[PDB]
Amino acid sequence: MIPDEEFIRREGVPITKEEIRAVSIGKLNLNKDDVVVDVGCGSGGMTVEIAKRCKFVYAIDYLDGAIEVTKQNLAKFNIKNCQIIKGRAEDVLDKLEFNKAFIGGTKNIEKIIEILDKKKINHIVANTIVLENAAKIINEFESRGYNVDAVNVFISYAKKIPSGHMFLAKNPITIIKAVR
């Protein structure tokens, strides 16, 4: 499944649009034995979709608002597959046993990627709207022996205006898949 209007949102807290999560989910190639860390503090959209397809998910979020909404969404789809961990991913990550990672939002991508790598995490998906990060992540992963597959995705949404349908875009996003 997937839908977007059936997610509990909250001003100040971002949510991945449906089409983006559909692509990002696919890149993770999730199965029943995957234990996934989901970094970067959002509303829970990706968390739920990941929870629904794997063994267990850690949602690492560092801001209160995000934790709260994710929590509500978790409640809302009856997810018992998931632990929300408040804090910096770089402080937490060492302590966990997992085999895949999705990274959204996040600070210290350079720290996280290095920890991921040395924890022998051999399948990672990262989304970024930022040019410098897209550049970092792709080169960081290729140097650390991953084969990298990145796509820039620019979605625009039909909106009716007096003359007909215009397409409303906001920001393109880079979705990066590193497997090793």
Add this chain to the structure above:
Amino acid sequence: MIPDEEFIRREGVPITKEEIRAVSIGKLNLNKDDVVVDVGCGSGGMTVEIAKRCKFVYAIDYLDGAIEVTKQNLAKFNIKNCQIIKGRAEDVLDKLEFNKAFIGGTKNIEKIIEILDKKKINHIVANTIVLENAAKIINEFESRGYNVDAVNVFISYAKKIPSGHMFLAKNPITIIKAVR
């Protein structure tokens, strides 16, 4: 799990990109009870992905190349709830029973839309790269009481080169969902 690129390809026969399939599969909102028609002469990417998800799928295709590749992929991924019906959708669709349509390329998109309309199909997703067809699909449907969520997706792929990476553009495609 949207499959990588383990698809049987035969050149002259297009394959819908992985990320475009993930978005279209998402907009279809598949249930195990869905009976889907899949109209479009491609390599079976979409077909397969629809089959894994619903009770049954009918691939409607006029093009021999397309059919055979599609048969091969269906074979490759062990898909058994799918029947291929060789013919022009405009000739056949009106005979079929199903409650959900996916439309890929097709000549005579008006006729097709008329048919889905009459049959009271409450859920249609259509991909097009043709300007005029995107216009007709959206307006024809909005005219018939469907509400229509259309998106345009521009995808580009990082390609490694001596200086770094460039992004090679693929052609943009409009993904139209119509629900009533």
